[PDB]
Amino acid sequence: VKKFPWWWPFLKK
């Protein structure tokens, strides 16, 4: 489910 800005999709590793 979407719950990111654009740069956060990053902050998951």
Tokens 């740069």 belong to: 7
Alpha-carbon span 4 to 13, nearest angstrom: 14
Q: What determination technique applies here? A: NMR
The three-state secondary structure class of 8 is: helix
Q: What does the block give as tokens for 7?
A: 């740069």
Alpha-carbon span 11 to 1, nearest angstrom: 15
Alpha-carbon span 5 to 8, nearest angstrom: 6
Alpha-carbon span 3 to 11, nearest angstrom: 12
Q: What does the block give as tokens for 13?
A: 């590793």
Tokens 């719950």 belong to: 3
Alpha-carbon span 2 to 12, nearest angstrom: 13
Alpha-carbon span 9 to 5, nearest angstrom: 7
